[PDB]
Scaffold this active site. Structure first.
Site, PDB file in Angstrom:
ATOM      1  N   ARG A 175      45.302  41.350  52.959  1.00 19.08           N
ATOM      2  CA  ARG A 175      44.937  40.646  54.192  1.00 19.08           C
ATOM      3  C   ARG A 175      45.702  39.328  54.327  1.00 19.08           C
ATOM      4  NH1 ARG A 175      38.533  38.761  53.421  1.00 19.08           N
ATOM      5  NH2 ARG A 175      38.724  37.743  51.368  1.00 19.08           N
ATOM      6  N   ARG A 179      42.891  30.712  56.859  1.00 17.51           N
ATOM      7  CA  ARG A 179      41.753  30.445  57.749  1.00 17.51           C
ATOM      8  C   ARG A 179      42.192  29.513  58.861  1.00 17.51           C
ATOM      9  NH1 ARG A 179      37.292  29.095  52.988  1.00 17.51           N
ATOM     10  NH2 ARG A 179      37.710  31.002  51.754  1.00 17.51           N
ATOM     11  N   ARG A 256      46.251  42.234  30.506  1.00 17.68           N
ATOM     12  CA  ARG A 256      46.698  40.845  30.604  1.00 17.68           C
ATOM     13  C   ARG A 256      45.661  39.976  29.876  1.00 17.68           C
ATOM     14  NH1 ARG A 256      46.828  39.280  36.682  1.00 17.68           N
ATOM     15  NH2 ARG A 256      45.308  37.560  36.603  1.00 17.68           N
ATOM     16  N   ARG A 287      45.901  26.630  35.826  1.00 19.55           N
ATOM     17  CA  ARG A 287      44.906  25.680  36.326  1.00 19.55           C
ATOM     18  C   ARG A 287      44.155  24.943  35.220  1.00 19.55           C
ATOM     19  NH1 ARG A 287      41.602  30.811  38.860  1.00 19.55           N
ATOM     20  NH2 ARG A 287      41.116  31.746  36.817  1.00 19.55           N
ATOM     21  N   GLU A 312      44.279  26.737  31.356  1.00 21.12           N
ATOM     22  CA  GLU A 312      44.324  28.201  31.307  1.00 21.12           C
ATOM     23  C   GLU A 312      45.759  28.717  31.330  1.00 21.12           C
ATOM     24  OE1 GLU A 312      41.590  30.419  34.106  1.00 21.12           O
ATOM     25  OE2 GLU A 312      43.420  31.611  34.485  1.00 21.12           O
ATOM     26  N   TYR A 363      38.330  45.967  36.569  1.00 16.99           N
ATOM     27  CA  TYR A 363      37.876  44.596  36.609  1.00 16.99           C
ATOM     28  C   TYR A 363      36.579  44.574  37.370  1.00 16.99           C
ATOM     29  CZ  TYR A 363      37.044  39.796  37.664  1.00 16.99           C
ATOM     30  OH  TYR A 363      36.443  38.569  37.830  1.00 16.99           O
ATOM     31  N   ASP A 365      33.617  41.836  38.877  1.00 12.81           N
ATOM     32  CA  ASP A 365      32.819  40.643  39.046  1.00 12.81           C
ATOM     33  C   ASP A 365      31.466  40.904  38.392  1.00 12.81           C
ATOM     34  OD1 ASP A 365      34.582  38.957  40.449  1.00 12.81           O
ATOM     35  OD2 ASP A 365      34.093  39.988  42.362  1.00 12.81           O
TER      36      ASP A 365
HETATM   37  C1  LIG Z   1      38.877  35.426  32.962  1.00  8.65           C
HETATM   38  C2  LIG Z   1      37.682  36.008  33.670  1.00  8.65           C
HETATM   39  C3  LIG Z   1      36.915  35.201  34.505  1.00  8.65           C
HETATM   40  C4  LIG Z   1      35.777  35.696  35.134  1.00  8.65           C
HETATM   41  C5  LIG Z   1      35.396  37.024  34.903  1.00  8.65           C
HETATM   42  C6  LIG Z   1      36.173  37.850  34.096  1.00  8.65           C
HETATM   43  C7  LIG Z   1      37.318  37.357  33.481  1.00  8.65           C
HETATM   44  C8  LIG Z   1      38.175  38.283  32.658  1.00  8.65           C
HETATM   45  N1  LIG Z   1      34.179  37.465  35.449  1.00  8.65           N
HETATM   46  C9  LIG Z   1      33.794  38.859  35.224  1.00  8.65           C
HETATM   47  C10 LIG Z   1      32.824  39.021  34.060  1.00  8.65           C
HETATM   48  O1  LIG Z   1      33.421  38.594  32.834  1.00  8.65           O
HETATM   49  C11 LIG Z   1      32.427  40.492  33.973  1.00  8.65           C
HETATM   50  O2  LIG Z   1      31.723  40.808  35.164  1.00  8.65           O
HETATM   51  C12 LIG Z   1      31.556  40.854  32.774  1.00  8.65           C
HETATM   52  O3  LIG Z   1      32.234  40.496  31.574  1.00  8.65           O
HETATM   53  C13 LIG Z   1      31.273  42.333  32.729  1.00  8.65           C
HETATM   54  O4  LIG Z   1      30.303  42.532  31.695  1.00  8.65           O
HETATM   55  P1  LIG Z   1      30.519  43.844  30.809  1.00  8.65           P
HETATM   56  O5  LIG Z   1      29.213  44.213  30.208  1.00  8.65           O
HETATM   57  O6  LIG Z   1      31.024  44.964  31.675  1.00  8.65           O
HETATM   58  O7  LIG Z   1      31.623  43.539  29.702  1.00  8.65           O
HETATM   59  P2  LIG Z   1      31.698  42.393  28.598  1.00  8.65           P
HETATM   60  O8  LIG Z   1      33.101  42.200  28.157  1.00  8.65           O
HETATM   61  O9  LIG Z   1      31.113  41.101  29.137  1.00  8.65           O
HETATM   62  O10 LIG Z   1      30.674  42.983  27.499  1.00  8.65           O
HETATM   63  C14 LIG Z   1      31.133  43.909  26.494  1.00  8.65           C
HETATM   64  C15 LIG Z   1      30.457  43.547  25.197  1.00  8.65           C
HETATM   65  O11 LIG Z   1      30.601  44.631  24.256  1.00  8.65           O
HETATM   66  C16 LIG Z   1      30.949  44.097  22.997  1.00  8.65           C
HETATM   67  N2  LIG Z   1      31.648  45.123  22.231  1.00  8.65           N
HETATM   68  C17 LIG Z   1      32.903  45.617  22.463  1.00  8.65           C
HETATM   69  N3  LIG Z   1      33.272  46.552  21.619  1.00  8.65           N
HETATM   70  C18 LIG Z   1      32.180  46.681  20.775  1.00  8.65           C
HETATM   71  C19 LIG Z   1      31.917  47.537  19.681  1.00  8.65           C
HETATM   72  N4  LIG Z   1      32.819  48.367  19.148  1.00  8.65           N
HETATM   73  N5  LIG Z   1      30.695  47.466  19.108  1.00  8.65           N
HETATM   74  C20 LIG Z   1      29.816  46.574  19.579  1.00  8.65           C
HETATM   75  N6  LIG Z   1      29.963  45.693  20.574  1.00  8.65           N
HETATM   76  C21 LIG Z   1      31.168  45.806  21.141  1.00  8.65           C
HETATM   77  C22 LIG Z   1      31.792  42.879  23.319  1.00  8.65           C
HETATM   78  O12 LIG Z   1      31.838  42.036  22.180  1.00  8.65           O
HETATM   79  C23 LIG Z   1      30.997  42.295  24.490  1.00  8.65           C
HETATM   80  O13 LIG Z   1      29.928  41.463  24.049  1.00  8.65           O
HETATM   81  C24 LIG Z   1      33.764  36.812  36.649  1.00  8.65           C
HETATM   82  N7  LIG Z   1      32.927  37.486  37.498  1.00  8.65           N
HETATM   83  C25 LIG Z   1      32.386  36.867  38.592  1.00  8.65           C
HETATM   84  O14 LIG Z   1      31.591  37.440  39.324  1.00  8.65           O
HETATM   85  N8  LIG Z   1      32.753  35.557  38.797  1.00  8.65           N
HETATM   86  C26 LIG Z   1      33.616  34.798  38.016  1.00  8.65           C
HETATM   87  O15 LIG Z   1      33.855  33.627  38.319  1.00  8.65           O
HETATM   88  C27 LIG Z   1      34.131  35.500  36.891  1.00  8.65           C
HETATM   89  N9  LIG Z   1      35.020  34.908  36.002  1.00  8.65           N
HETATM   90  C1  LIG Z   2      44.114  39.715  42.279  1.00  7.38           C
HETATM   91  C2  LIG Z   2      42.964  39.492  41.338  1.00  7.38           C
HETATM   92  O1  LIG Z   2      42.830  40.151  40.308  1.00  7.38           O
HETATM   93  N1  LIG Z   2      42.096  38.513  41.683  1.00  7.38           N
HETATM   94  C3  LIG Z   2      40.939  38.147  40.876  1.00  7.38           C
HETATM   95  C4  LIG Z   2      40.932  36.670  40.496  1.00  7.38           C
HETATM   96  O2  LIG Z   2      40.777  35.799  41.609  1.00  7.38           O
HETATM   97  P1  LIG Z   2      40.709  34.131  41.549  1.00  7.38           P
HETATM   98  O3  LIG Z   2      39.790  33.509  42.540  1.00  7.38           O
HETATM   99  O4  LIG Z   2      40.393  33.648  40.097  1.00  7.38           O
HETATM  100  O5  LIG Z   2      42.188  33.661  41.910  1.00  7.38           O
HETATM  101  P2  LIG Z   2      43.590  33.738  41.157  1.00  7.38           P
HETATM  102  O6  LIG Z   2      43.965  32.381  40.680  1.00  7.38           O
HETATM  103  O7  LIG Z   2      43.504  34.725  39.970  1.00  7.38           O
HETATM  104  O8  LIG Z   2      44.501  34.346  42.342  1.00  7.38           O
HETATM  105  C5  LIG Z   2      44.738  35.762  42.495  1.00  7.38           C
HETATM  106  C6  LIG Z   2      46.107  35.902  43.111  1.00  7.38           C
HETATM  107  O9  LIG Z   2      46.155  35.128  44.332  1.00  7.38           O
HETATM  108  C7  LIG Z   2      47.400  34.456  44.446  1.00  7.38           C
HETATM  109  N2  LIG Z   2      47.154  32.995  44.450  1.00  7.38           N
HETATM  110  C8  LIG Z   2      45.924  32.471  44.097  1.00  7.38           C
HETATM  111  C9  LIG Z   2      45.705  31.145  44.003  1.00  7.38           C
HETATM  112  C10 LIG Z   2      46.774  30.228  44.274  1.00  7.38           C
HETATM  113  O10 LIG Z   2      46.714  28.985  44.157  1.00  7.38           O
HETATM  114  N3  LIG Z   2      47.964  30.823  44.652  1.00  7.38           N
HETATM  115  C11 LIG Z   2      48.218  32.172  44.763  1.00  7.38           C
HETATM  116  O11 LIG Z   2      49.305  32.598  45.123  1.00  7.38           O
HETATM  117  C12 LIG Z   2      48.288  34.941  43.288  1.00  7.38           C
HETATM  118  O12 LIG Z   2      49.127  36.022  43.688  1.00  7.38           O
HETATM  119  C13 LIG Z   2      47.252  35.374  42.245  1.00  7.38           C
HETATM  120  O13 LIG Z   2      47.746  36.381  41.363  1.00  7.38           O
HETATM  121  O14 LIG Z   2      39.842  36.392  39.639  1.00  7.38           O
HETATM  122  C14 LIG Z   2      38.573  36.622  40.278  1.00  7.38           C
HETATM  123  C15 LIG Z   2      37.505  36.143  39.310  1.00  7.38           C
HETATM  124  O15 LIG Z   2      37.880  36.344  37.942  1.00  7.38           O
HETATM  125  C16 LIG Z   2      38.438  38.087  40.703  1.00  7.38           C
HETATM  126  O16 LIG Z   2      37.227  38.252  41.439  1.00  7.38           O
HETATM  127  C17 LIG Z   2      39.628  38.529  41.559  1.00  7.38           C
HETATM  128  O17 LIG Z   2      39.586  39.936  41.776  1.00  7.38           O
END
Ligand SMILES: Cc1cc2c(cc1C)N(C[C@H](O)[C@H](O)[C@H](O)COP(=O)(O)OP(=O)(O)OC[C@H]1O[C@@H](n3cnc4c(N)ncnc43)[C@H](O)[C@@H]1O)c1[nH]c(=O)[nH]c(=O)c1N2
Ligand SMILES: CC(=O)N[C@H]1[C@@H](OP(=O)(O)OP(=O)(O)OC[C@H]2O[C@@H](n3ccc(=O)[nH]c3=O)[C@H](O)[C@@H]2O)O[C@H](CO)[C@@H](O)[C@@H]1O
Ligand SMILES: Cc1cc2c(cc1C)N(C[C@H](O)[C@H](O)[C@H](O)COP(=O)(O)OP(=O)(O)OC[C@H]1O[C@@H](n3cnc4c(N)ncnc43)[C@H](O)[C@@H]1O)c1[nH]c(=O)[nH]c(=O)c1N2
Ligand SMILES: CC(=O)N[C@H]1[C@@H](OP(=O)(O)OP(=O)(O)OC[C@H]2O[C@@H](n3ccc(=O)[nH]c3=O)[C@H](O)[C@@H]2O)O[C@H](CO)[C@@H](O)[C@@H]1O
Ligand code: NA
Ligand code: NA
Lengths: 386, 386
Positions: A175, A179, A256, A287, A312, A363, A365
């Site tokens: 999209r 805004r 990643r 960031r 990060e 992935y 949320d």
């Molecule tokens: C960098 C980043 C940032 C964000 C987010 C993700 C990431 C990657 N999240 C998403 C959020 O992290 C996600 O929704 C949850 O981790 C999902 O929970 P899960 O139970 O699916 O997996 P999750 O990874 O949390 O749980 C899996 C668990 O299983 C355990 N495990 C794995 N293998 C095992 C084994 N062999 N035996 C026993 N235990 C084991 C792990 O140790 C872990 O405790 C997010 N979402 C959102 O809505 N807003 C946000 O701002 C963010 N921010």
């Molecule tokens: C594409 C993707 O996986 N997005 C995830 C990312 O979004 P989140 O809100 O954390 O934003 P990001 O910083 O990861 O931006 C996602 C993408 O937007 C673009 N960008 C963003 C910010 C900026 O200043 N400039 C720019 O160009 C880039 O192409 C970047 O790869 O993390 C969120 C929370 O973990 C998830 O809900 C989203 O699904």
């Protein structure tokens, strides 16, 4: 039996299945967690010097438009009125973000009315028609034009993915990222906040049930044969890595990852905002998070002249490295499909269900994970426990 | 009797006294209102062409930190999650507002960290020490320095009050008007929102009680002798103009007034924000309100290509003109004191209580008026009706 259901992993997916089985079906639930902490990647702990809550697997902001999910999670925790806002650092200036009349004013020199800005964008972006775009640089330029693209997307994107955008898929921007108002709420969802007593407290409240047992520091693969032997007809909800389950017998799924450089500075306020994006190549990190600002309702439990920040960094995952974001090379989506049919079979012969972020290579949320767990509970698990 | 209490005026003060008398004491309450509308200066009506709610006695934003007031008003209406934000227009650029790291970045050319900005302000403002300031220009310059003062306060202040700031009192600026963060919430109060079904609906809900009678289009002074004759021992709560009560027998109290130029434009979005302050002399008005943005949760009941705006002009009140803000010349605070002793006597001999914005020559926020009414109810009126 001592337990009726085994849940591997104590993240949101696991915990949701556990709590529902415990409170709705009255079943005994054993949760097995590899780490020492409860809660999976949502977990937070206090930084020891300052007492400030930090999230050590990335900043987590809770937001949803899914009323069912919202009502559910409020059973275990209250939320604050926190609304997420982000600023974007470019050439020594903090820009209002995302792209709206705010950023447009600062960048192009003067104020544009909403209508004036639609027209401004129409001109900047007519260099490329959208249907004729091949890679990501083109697609973006096609939507907002070169000046904006090069100042706010190019270097930032290149850091997140370690790659020139020209070498990136066009289908990644879907999209128009602008805004035509001054509304800089970062998220457009109905419900939004942070857990009042932090994440740890919330997740821990989910497992606080008479019918739920938790064993921290326990790898499923070291105890599975023992445990299933105690009750062979207890089903398993596995939320660990999908490939590692089947001993990478179809190749390693590609993730990643993120490195988190966390410092304690001797000032009470480092940037006066929760999150500052850095959009220039000059800086290694994408960031900087300053965690005290996530909870300003605590300012009188926070150090006056110290603050915790956290830079990060993004790159690809070697083994050992935490998996964060699925990469989805089409070579990756390939060994996925084969693993899904391994799982389905395994589900039918072993009563082992696959869910969650790691277990499905998806992935999620937080609210999406919770909804996915509630789905699997109602549609698959209620039958499985009768 | 047909009534037990007479309330003159149906603004928040009147309505609060009325509702409390009706629901807590069970007394019959007659409300007498001069205008044709219920609700006093808080009243809103739909603009007829577009259907958009406008407030025709100034924009009203509801905010309080007074839990008692908050719980009270939620009996009669729900509030939205609206948070007020303002932008400041200066030399063709919309500035983030009020003065914080946001405005500082845009104005001075680059980003300043919170600490960097404290130091920036320390230098700019050391031209004048604060205790040695005589008028308003000096006081302000003494706190934020000339560049900021002249760009954001001088012309704006001069428009609101029709006067050079050097001819204005130093005691009018009392705290430092700068934030050293990016938080641009306009108000610092605990509770904040707009009434979900608009103000009219809310005020009208307050008077909706079996024990309350309302007579619109009725001047108290034309009917007072008739009505008090129907029940001589019914007390009166007067919320009309204090001086006019005593036939200006101590001179006319001096008010600042407002003229409201309201247009319907053929665009869906004129400035993409609720309120835009104009800080330059080039413009007659202090600010422009665009009312659709006060209620974005209604965007699908709003015209797609029309919007109502409203420019606000300030000046002094001739008679006939609505009183808005008390001026408080010390010559004014003089004839006030004499009127307070007129009122006190009148209260003791006639059972006529004086309250509210007009009746006490005081500016009141809505929550302040409601609290003042609840005070007078508990402390004076409960006894008066026994
Ligand atoms: C960098 C980043 C940032 C964000 C987010 C993700 C990431 C990657 N999240 C998403 C959020 O992290 C996600 O929704 C949850 O981790 C999902 O929970 P899960 O139970 O699916 O997996 P999750 O990874 O949390 O749980 C899996 C668990 O299983 C355990 N495990 C794995 N293998 C095992 C084994 N062999 N035996 C026993 N235990 C084991 C792990 O140790 C872990 O405790 C997010 N979402 C959102 O809505 N807003 C946000 O701002 C963010 N921010
Ligand atoms: C594409 C993707 O996986 N997005 C995830 C990312 O979004 P989140 O809100 O954390 O934003 P990001 O910083 O990861 O931006 C996602 C993408 O937007 C673009 N960008 C963003 C910010 C900026 O200043 N400039 C720019 O160009 C880039 O192409 C970047 O790869 O993390 C969120 C929370 O973990 C998830 O809900 C989203 O699904
Ligand atoms: C320009 C402007 C803007 C704002 C605000 C004020 C002003 C001036 N308000 C404040 C708000 O208007 C104020 O709190 C209420 O008007 C106070 O209600 P009262 O009952 O005291 O007087 P109010 O003026 O509302 O009520 C008096 C009533 O008595 C009637 N009356 C007078 N003489 C009469 C007579 N002889 N006989 C019969 N009836 C008679 C009048 O017609 C009127 O209906 C505000 N507050 C806030 O919290 N947030 C905001 O954003 C704003 N915005
Ligand atoms: C001093 C005063 O009576 N303030 C009232 C005013 O505040 P409100 O929030 O409406 O702000 P105003 O526009 O009236 O500003 C008040 C004063 O602040 C200064 N200023 C403000 C904005 C700006 O861009 N530049 C500038 O210099 C001026 O000196 C001005 O006289 O209305 C509110 C709601 O009706 C009331 O709660 C406040 O009590
Ligand atoms: Na285009
Ligand atoms: Na000074």
């Amino acid at each position: 039996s001592d337990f009726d259901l085994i849940v591997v992993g104590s993240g949101l997916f696991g915990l949701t299945v556990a709590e529902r089985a415990a409170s709705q079906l009255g079943k005994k639930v054993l949760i097995v967690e590899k780490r020492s902490h409860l809660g999976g990647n949502a977990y937070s702990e206090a930084e020891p010097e300052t007492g400030i809550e930090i999230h050590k697997y990335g900043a987590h902001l809770f937001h949803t438009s899914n009323k069912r999910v919202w009502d559910y999670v409020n059973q275990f925790t209250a939320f604050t009125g926190y609304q997420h806002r982000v600023f974007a650092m470019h050439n020594g200036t903090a820009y209002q973000f995302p792209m709206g009349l705010g950023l447009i004013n600062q960048f192009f020199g003067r104020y544009y009315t909403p209508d004036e800005a639609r027209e401004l964008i129409k001109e900047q972006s007519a260099e490329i028609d959208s249907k004729d775009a091949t890679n990501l640089e083109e697609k973006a330029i096609s939507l907002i034009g070169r000046p904006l693209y090069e100042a706010f997307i190019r270097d930032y994107t290149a850091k997140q993915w370690q790659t020139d955008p020209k070498e990136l898929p066009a289908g990644n921007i879907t999209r128009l990222p602008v805004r035509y108002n001054f509304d800089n709420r970062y998220f457009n969802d109905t419900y939004e906040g942070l857990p009042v007593d932090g994440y740890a407290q919330w997740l821990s409240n989910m497992a606080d049930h008479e019918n739920i047992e938790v064993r921290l520091d326990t790898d499923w693969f070291e105890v599975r044969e023992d445990l299933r032997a105690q009750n062979p007809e207890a089903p398993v909800v596995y939320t660990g890595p999908l490939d590692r389950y089947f001993d990478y017998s179809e190749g390693h799924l590609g993730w990643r990852t993120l490195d988190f450089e966390t410092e304690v500075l001797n000032t009470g306020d480092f940037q006066g905002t929760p999150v500052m994006n850095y959009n220039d190549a000059e800086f290694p990190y994408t960031r900087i998070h300053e965690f005290r600002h996530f909870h300003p309702e605590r300012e009188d439990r926070h150090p006056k002249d110290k603050t915790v920040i956290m830079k990060e960094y993004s790159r690809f995952a070697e083994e050992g490295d935490e998996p964060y974001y699925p990469i989805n090379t089409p070579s990756d989506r390939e060994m996925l499909f084969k693993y899904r049919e391994l799982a389905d079979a395994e589900t039918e012969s072993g009563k082992v269900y696959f869910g969650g972020r790691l277990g499905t290579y998806q992935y999620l949320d937080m609210h999406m994970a919770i909804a996915s767990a509630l789905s699997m509970f109602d549609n698959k698990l209620v039958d499985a426990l009768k």
